[PDB]
């Protein structure tokens, strides 16, 4: 455990949720698969990788619903006809594992989580608001 005066020398990677605990899907998976992963894991948005573990975007329940809401009914038969790549968000913030934690703190003001990558955009984890708030609450209650 770090002391308060060390927290800003820390890196994103030291506090991220590591990739092997992160639910994610792939660019070529269909929306039925992505919706099932979102629903079973209980998350509203998760990262999207390719088969080489490169980070490409985010997919969420709201995006999927907006793709299948029809005029008169929910067109669920389209879920397995559409790929994640066609509807995912690609305009996403990114952190590097070696970025200073203060950069991560700033980015979660406007983002519930931020994806973390190594070199070459290889996915490494996510940097969440809960981790920031848990840590900052500890250090304010001590100070």
Ligand X SMILES: Nc1nc2c(ncn2[C@@H]2O[C@@H]3COP(=O)(O)O[C@H]4[C@@H](O)[C@H](n5cnc6c(N)ncnc65)O[C@@H]4COP(=O)(O)O[C@H]3[C@H]2O)c(=O)[nH]1
- CA 32, CA 51: separation in Å to the nearest integer? 18
Supply the angle between the helices 61-68 and 31-41 in degrees, to the nearest 10: 140
Choose the binding region for ligand X from 5-13, 25-33, 82-90, 105-113 (rule: CB under 6 A).
Answer: 105-113
- CA 16, CA 47: separation in Å to the nearest integer? 14
Residue 44 binds to its own copies (criterion: CB under 8 A): yes
23 is an annotated ligand-binding site residue: yes
Residue 106 binds to ligand X (criterion: CB under 6 A): no
Shortest Cβ 58–ligand X spacing (Å) = 8
Distances (CA, A) of 91 to 6, 88, 114: 32, 9, 12
For residue 57, list its beta bridge partners. 48
Which tokens in the block code for residue 133? 């708030």
Residue 62 binds to its own copies (criterion: CB under 8 A): yes
Residue 2 binds to ligand X (criterion: CB under 6 A): no
Task: Give the chain's length.
Answer: 143
Residues found near its own copies in the complex (CB under 8 A):
32, 35-36, 38-40, 42-45, 60-62, 65-66, 69, 73-74, 76-77, 79, 102, 105-106, 108-110, 112, 129-130, 132-134, 136-137, 140-141
Pick out the residues of the known binding site for 3',3'-c-di-AMP: 21, 23, 44-45, 129
């Amino acid at each position: 455990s770090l002391q308060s005066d060390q927290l800003l020398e820390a890196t994103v990677g030291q506090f991220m949720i590591e990739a092997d605990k992160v639910a994610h899907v792939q660019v070529g998976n269909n929306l039925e698969h992505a919706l099932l992963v979102l629903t079973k894991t209980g998350y509203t948005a998760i990262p999207v990788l390719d088969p080489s573990y490169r980070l490409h975007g985010l997919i969420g329940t709201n995006m999927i619903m907006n793709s299948i809401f029809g005029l008169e009914r929910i067109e669920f038969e389209k879920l397995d006809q559409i790929t994640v790549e066609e509807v995912m968000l690609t305009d996403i913030p990114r952190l590097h594992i070696n970025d200073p934690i203060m950069k991560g703190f700033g980015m979660v003001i406007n983002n519930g989580f931020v994806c973390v990558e190594n070199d070459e955009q290889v996915f490494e984890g996510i940097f969440t608001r809960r981790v920031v708030l848990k840590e900052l609450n500890k250090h304010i209650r001590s100070l």
